[PDB]
Amino acid sequence: LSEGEWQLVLHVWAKVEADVAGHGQDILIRLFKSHPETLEKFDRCKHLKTEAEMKASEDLKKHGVTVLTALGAILKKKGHHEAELKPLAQSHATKHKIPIKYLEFISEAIIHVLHSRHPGDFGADAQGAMNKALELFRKDIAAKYKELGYQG
């Protein structure tokens, strides 16, 4: 990414940081509605059936904050994120067993929520920048997955 593209990424991410939990809720709800098979990866989660139940779930809201906190730290590294990706690849390859296709699904949900909530800060320039940033994340975590023996 160019420096300008990183700045577009972090500009819209600052909007996410104004209410991390609400963004995380919308992102995970979009993920679970669009790809319900991902629900099975979480404990005490398959039982959630309606959007209202999903919005009421403290576990879901906590999880969305966990995801966005870690992703935001990664994005702020502007690609220099090997030390941040290392523990994530470790757990997601060997314990949670999250295939790259699921990381694509959550990337799509992130982009959907950012476009829905911040269209003025998420035009084609910023969309493409965020696309590139999330593609770089997925590329680098996929390489670490394989180092750990996981071909997902």
Residue appearing with tokens 């030390």: 83
| Residues in 38-97 at the binding interface with ligand A1D9G, rule: CB under 6 A | 42-45, 48, 57, 59-60, 63
Query: HSE on the CB side for 89, CA within 13 Å?
Result: 23
Minimum CB separation of residue 59 from Cu ion in Å reads: 6
With respect to ligand HEM, which residue has the nearer C-beta, 97 or 146? 97
Using Cβ positions, the residue closest to ligand HEM within the complex turns out to be 91
Total residues at interface with ligand A1D9G (CB under 6 A): 9
**102-119 exposure pattern, b = at least 16 Cβ within 10 A, e = fewer:** bbebbbbbbbebbbebbe
Known binding residues for nitrite are 63
State the residues that interact with ligand A1D9G by CB under 6 A: 42-45, 48, 57, 59-60, 63
